[PDB]
């Protein structure tokens, strides 16, 4: 199920999305496309709820991290019951 979280090559490696994410969906991995030498990654999208905090945080001209809401699970619906 889960949502989809894509990271595009306009990433500047500021990591603000990872710090904003309240469910630990994102990581920083080494890259060579930007000065910061790091790119955001979404290795745990099965826990992603889709609150869009990462997108709120992204500074690049139109987001370099994009959350497309998809199939809804109890983890993705933020359910505690």
């Amino acid at each position: 199920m889960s949502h989809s979280v894509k990271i595009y090559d306009t990433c500047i490696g500021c990591t603000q999305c990872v710090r904003a994410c309240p469910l630990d969906v994102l990581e920083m991995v080494p890259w060579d496309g930007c000065k910061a030498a790091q790119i955001a990654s979404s290795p745990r999208t099965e826990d992603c709820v889709g609150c869009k905090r990462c997108e709120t945080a992204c500074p690049t001209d139109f987001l370099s991290i994009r959350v497309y809401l998809g199939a809804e699970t109890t983890r993705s619906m933020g359910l505690a019951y």
């Binding site: 630990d24 990654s41 505690a80």
Partner: protein, 141 residues
Amino acid sequence: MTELSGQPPKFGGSTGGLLSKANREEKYAITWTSASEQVFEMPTGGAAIMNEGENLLYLARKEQCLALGTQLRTKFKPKIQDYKIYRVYPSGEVQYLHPADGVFPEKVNEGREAQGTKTRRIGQNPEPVTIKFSGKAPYEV
């Protein structure tokens, strides 16, 4: 993963805690080491008391454990950056979740494989008509 240790925080009880899901579906655990007995905000409402030494707490959701973790690492005199978060299944199986490779994700780390990476800009996604009658959306290709 193995067994989890730690003392339950001093607390009298809330209505905001675990429900039938915890036994039927899944649960989450957060462990942390505290320097003293100090009061902290319970993510399910109320104030609880963490004990000096090890503390294990069971919560209903991963986001609740992560909110407690941010509170531990941001609101305490000696900061607590020691908490570990696990997913607990009713079969007794425990799954280590956070922090993945022993390092917080905000900072880079070697041996991490990029996932969700797209080798193009947003404006370089294909047109939906070029992919209709497949099952894919322009970000999935």
